[PDB]
């Protein structure tokens, strides 16, 4: 109900918010089972695992979405069809 370019950022980030939650590289918020759970696709267990951040909001999100929309509920092993990712890296000057 809104055109893709409605969500284009100052620096031309396309679909910046309100389309998909992007996984973040921060941990905090809702923790999970306070006992060693094996949910890392067979690569060990996690104890009292903090949620991974998700930013921007998704298409369903309504008016929650935006440049600062943040959801600290989902564990790193959760998966949903509105959870994607965007990439970042440092600026190199030489």
């Amino acid at each position: 109900t809104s055109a893709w370019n409605i969500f284009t950022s100052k620096w031309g980030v396309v679909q910046a918010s309100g389309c998909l939650w992007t996984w973040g590289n921060e941990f905090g918020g809702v923790n999970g089972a306070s006992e060693y759970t094996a949910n890392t696709g067979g690569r060990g267990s996690v104890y009292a695992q903090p949620a991974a951040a998700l930013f921007g909001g998704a298409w369903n999100g309504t008016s929650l979405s935006g440049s600062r929309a943040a959801l600290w509920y989902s564990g790193p092993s959760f998966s949903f069809a509105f959870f994607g990712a965007r990439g970042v890296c440092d600026h190199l000057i030489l």
Partner: protein, 508 residues
Amino acid sequence: DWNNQSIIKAGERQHGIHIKQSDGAGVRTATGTTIKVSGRQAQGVLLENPAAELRFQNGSVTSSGQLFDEGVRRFLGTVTVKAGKLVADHATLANVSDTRDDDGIALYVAGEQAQASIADSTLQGAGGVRVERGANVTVQRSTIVDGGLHIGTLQPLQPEDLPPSRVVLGDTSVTAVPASGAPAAVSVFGANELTVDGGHITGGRAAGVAAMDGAIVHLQRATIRRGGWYGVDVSDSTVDLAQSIVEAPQLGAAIRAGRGARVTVSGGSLSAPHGNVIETGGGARRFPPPASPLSITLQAGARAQGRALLYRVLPEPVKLTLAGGAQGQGDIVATELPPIPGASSGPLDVALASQARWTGATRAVDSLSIDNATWVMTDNSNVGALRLASDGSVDFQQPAEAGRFKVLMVDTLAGSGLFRMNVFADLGLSDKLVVMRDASGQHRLWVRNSGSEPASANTMLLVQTPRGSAATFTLANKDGKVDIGTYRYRLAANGNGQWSLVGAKAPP
């Protein structure tokens, strides 16, 4: 319709009894009809018709398959009602499976037209009973063996629309085994109602009962034990405790409330031998408007015992109220340091009313008001604003150690009350009441002899007040005197509001 049969469907996604959304529109019924479904993603009973009523008696519905729908990835139960009425009588509803694979939900009622009335039945599997999304359930004389009861949830990644769920319990007994992982034995999230009438709520990883995000929970003649754990955990929602009993371990509290919670305890009992009876805070929600400053009321003869009667988590305001002859012995403590040094903190306000009785000590209470009640003070104490009325008293407790006096310090004093105080005449020492900023009103002092036979007659300071305070005190021992051995003492105010107890040799 179904009689003494043995419907077993190992068939995958094959439901023991299924009633189609547009099947026949009428009353079904089944007796002694034991069911078993091993087929993965297939419930024992699935009711889906807003017009069909299913009556299930003396049977036994069980499933082993890994149940769950991909209609927003929520994992169903061995009997699921999504539309229509279910009537269960003397039934076993079991769900055997895995931890990681299945949740083990025995009963699942969800939807604006989903209804269930479990009577004399028993439900098991590590998922327990789950109700949500506008459903109505009534459970009587039954047992939730290991999975617990769970009404509503928090945000399923989207806007929660409205329609409330109502659940009524007639002396059943909900348990949540440590094995089941479940965080609370009973839990109500969102705008939903639970009425409990008698029974044993026992279990929970973290709490016995959890009510959050605007729940209404009426617990009546329930008994709540573990079997740091909390008895009842509240939020921004209403919890009422009538004639119930709540016990807590050393590491815990009988009640935790925070974020604008409203708790009423009438009758019953709350003990926490080595912990707190009531805890306040731990889950930050900061708004400048004074909403419903989280309040706890112990009324109608409530009993409450622990190492502290109220522990405040700091930087939320609290309003503790003992009324209707309730009695609580604890201590009332705060954290000493606030989280943010130099910001506003609201008050810790206690109100002792109609016949009530707190027995303890404090240096955390901001504003205490005793009114036709009594604070039995057990040790040195600090209160901001003190206010009395209608025979409100502050009974200094008689020390077991002779010579050991207690002192109450107060910022401001107002109204009219009585102070029972201890006197050690042979030592020339007495309990003291110090008011530091402002004193006013008519107060009465009643002296207790607690160190008999004085060598001489010697003055003993009893009350200290500011500049030229407006407060009057009068010795309430009859005839305005106390005879300690062969000596008579009277109260005299001297200079700048300092009321001492003078006395000399008693008239022959």
